[model samples]
Target chain A: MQIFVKTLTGKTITLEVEPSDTIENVKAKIQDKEGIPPDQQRLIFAGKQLEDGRTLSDYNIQKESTLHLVLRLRGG
Target chain B: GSTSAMWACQHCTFMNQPGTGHCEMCSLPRT
Candidate 1:
């Protein structure tokens, strides 16, 4: 299904994922597309962790769903 | 919450353990 997505790095990007694809997979793909590393990525959708093991399917994300991937600032 | 050190960027997704600002690329403002 087609997914509406945006990254905190201020990029206009989207993804077309399959049902079998999980959030983890999407995260990796996002990293690749945005040229970000896992350590630098902190994805949170609707105030929840878009963790490495979770899938969009688990969250019941339908077509045209938009999620925000905010890039956290490293500091004290 | 305990304040821990971590390397992150508000402009780009480049997170390190800590003590790194001004993103490796793009050179955005870092904290």
Candidate 2:
């Protein structure tokens, strides 16, 4: 499946993910491509953690899907 | 986690907090 979304740092990335790709796998890919840390990342779909260990299939991810790997910012 | 108020940017995926114009990150204008 192909996933497209812009990183928190404002970079647009398109990922071709496998059906078995887990959230962890996606995180690694994001870090490699966007330099965003996994710890500070939040893979949100429809306003929720795509949930660790879950595959894109588990989340009903589809083609032309856009899953946002948002960088979690800390503040007061 | 409701979509009624909050909006996620199509460009950066940054969830714009309620009542905001551009996205928090990309500064893309929100509707």
Candidate 3:
């Protein structure tokens, strides 16, 4: 399945993945394209944080599913 | 909501507005 990632800058990147692909895998792909580390990327779908250990099927993500990518921040 | 409340992006050091889930300058996710 192909998923769409909408970056914070409004850039959309398409990722080809499978239902069994983990969220960490997704992040790695994004990192490859955007230069942001997997640990520094946060994936959000359906208004909830996508866990790294979860698979695309776990979140019911399908073709053309939109995920928001945000830069992880560290602060109080 | 207070617009003045901001968080600095760890990647770019850009201060983001409150409720901004990502950094405006670097486009990094606000965790």
Candidate 4:
């Protein structure tokens, strides 16, 4: 399955994954490609935040869909 | 897995806990 990950910079990353893959799995892949720490990534779809323990199928996130990757910016 | 603070490392596949910047097993950078 293919999905899209869009960052704040308007960059789009395409990834091939399985339905059983969890959000953490996807994040690791994103880290591999873009060097963004997995812990710093927040995946969102349809206005809902994706859970790291849950699978893609759990959220009904279909192929070719776009997931907004919101960063965990440091705040003081 | 409490509060979902653990993260998977790309190089080692280790489930690293919160506040850690590297993997526990392989010590790979979380990035």
On DockQ, the leading prediction is: 2
- Report clash pairs, candidate 2: none
Which candidate comes out best when scored by lDDT?
A: 3
Top candidate by TM-score: 4
Q: CA lDDT of each candidate?
A: 0.62, 0.70, 0.75, 0.73
The lowest-lDDT stretch of 10 consecutive residues in candidate 4 chain A is A67-76
Question: For residues B1-31, what per-residue lDDT tens digits would candidate 1 score against the true structure?
Answer: 9776865454434453455555443345576
Q: Over the stretch B1-31, how does candidate 2's per-residue lDDT look in tens digits?
A: 7665777766655567778776654456786
CA shift of A30, model 2, Å: 0.9
CA deviation > 4 Å runs, candidate 2:
A8-10, B1-31
* Local error of candidate 3 at residue B21 (angstroms): 12
TM-score of each: 0.59, 0.63, 0.66, 0.67
True contacts kept of 1: 0.06
Q: Score the docking of each candidate (DockQ).
A: 0.08, 0.19, 0.08, 0.03
Better of 2 and 4 by lDDT: 4
Error of 3 at A70 (Å): 0.3
Clash pairs detected, candidate 3: A70-B28, A70-B29, A71-B28, A71-B29, A71-B30, A72-B29, A73-B31
RMSD of each: 7.2, 5.2, 7.4, 10.5
Q: What ordering of candidates by lDDT runs from best to worst?
A: 3, 4, 2, 1
Q: Write the per-residue lDDT of candidate 3 for residues A1-76, one digit (tens) a residue.
A: 8889877666889988888889988988887877887776878775556778899889888877888777756652
lDDT of 1 by residue, A1-76 (tens): 8765566546666877765578877778777777767665665545345566877777767777776565555543
Candidate 4 residue lDDT tens string, A1-76? 9889876567899998778889988998888898888776777665456778899999898888787675665432
Error of 4 at A54 (Å): 0.5
Could you tell me the TM-score of candidate 4? 0.67
